[PDB]
Amino acid sequence: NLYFQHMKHGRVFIIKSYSEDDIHRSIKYNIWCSTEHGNKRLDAAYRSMNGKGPVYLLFSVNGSGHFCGVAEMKSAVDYNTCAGVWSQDKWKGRFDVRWIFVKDVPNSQLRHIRLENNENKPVTNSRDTQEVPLEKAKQVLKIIASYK
Ligand SMILES: Oc1cnnc(S)n1
Numbered sequence: 001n002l003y004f005q006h007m008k009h010g011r012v013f014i015i016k017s018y019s020e021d022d023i024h025r026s027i028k029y030n031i032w033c034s035t036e037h038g039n040k041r042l043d044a045a046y047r048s049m050n051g052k053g054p055v056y057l058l059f060s061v062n063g064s065g066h067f068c069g070v071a072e073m074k075s076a077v078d079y080n081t082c083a084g085v086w087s088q089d090k091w092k093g094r095f096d097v098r099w100i101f102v103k104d105v106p107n108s109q110l111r112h113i114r115l116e117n118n119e120n121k122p123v124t125n126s127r128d129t130q131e132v133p134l135e136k137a138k139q140v141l142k143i144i145a146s147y148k
Contacts, residue, residue, distance in 0.1 A: 003145035004138055009053030011045045012137035014126040017061050019087035023068060027099055030074070032057070033091040038129040042095070043077040045131070057097065058132070058140060060124075067110065069102040070144055105147045113139050 015034070017023055026032050034042060046055050055073035060066065074096040081094045107124040113136050114120050123132065123140060132140065 001142055001146050004141045007054070007134070007138060009049070010056065010134055010137070011049065011053070012056045012058065012132040012134065012141075013042060013045070014123070014128065014130040014132060015057045015059045016126070016128040017059065020061050022087050022091075023059065023061060025086070026071075026097065027069075027102055030097050030099065031094050032071070032097050033086060033093045033095070034129055035090075036092075039077045039079070039093050039095075041129045041131075042073060046073050046076055046095070056100075056137070056141065058137075058144075066104045066106045067144060068104055069099060070141060071097040071099045074098050101144055103144065103147065105144045109143055109147060110140060113143075 033039070042055065049055055057071045057073060058067060059069050059071065061068055077093055077095045079093050083089055083092060111122045111124040113123045115123060115126070115130070115132060115136060117133055118126065118130060123136065
């Protein structure tokens with residue numbers, strides 16, 4: 001398949017969400033927020049990249065048994081922003097994103113991909129902002145990119 005070849009330099013992260021409504025707001029406005037340490041993690045991966053490659057985000061609603069799409073981080077993290085705009089006031093902050101695929105891909109299509117940096121646990125077992133090794137990430141993205 002013809003998706004995501006020549007990723008070159010890159011870093012990929014798992015996004016776990018407790019609110020579909022947050023996902024929809026994120027699609028509607030190309031913005032996201034994570035935890036305090038989630039924000040610090042993605043912030044570093046974004047600032048250290050210096051435009052030289054894409055920071056991609058893989059999205060899954062918790063308990064949903066699927067992934068729900070793919071997006072690219074498009075800015076650093078802003079820590080002083082309007083409170084209370086997400087489902088919980090515990091999401092303080094904002095960075096921009098750009099959604100690339102909005103589609104549901106069942107975990108049955110992805111669970112045989114494992115993260116050697118997560119004690120060999122499957123990709124579908126990740127917590128929020130679990131980083132993915134570039135070579136397994138490429139597998140995930142291509143699986144989602146082309147799922148029918
Ligand atoms: O459940 C979550 C997780 N991360 N961000 C937001 S806005 N909601």
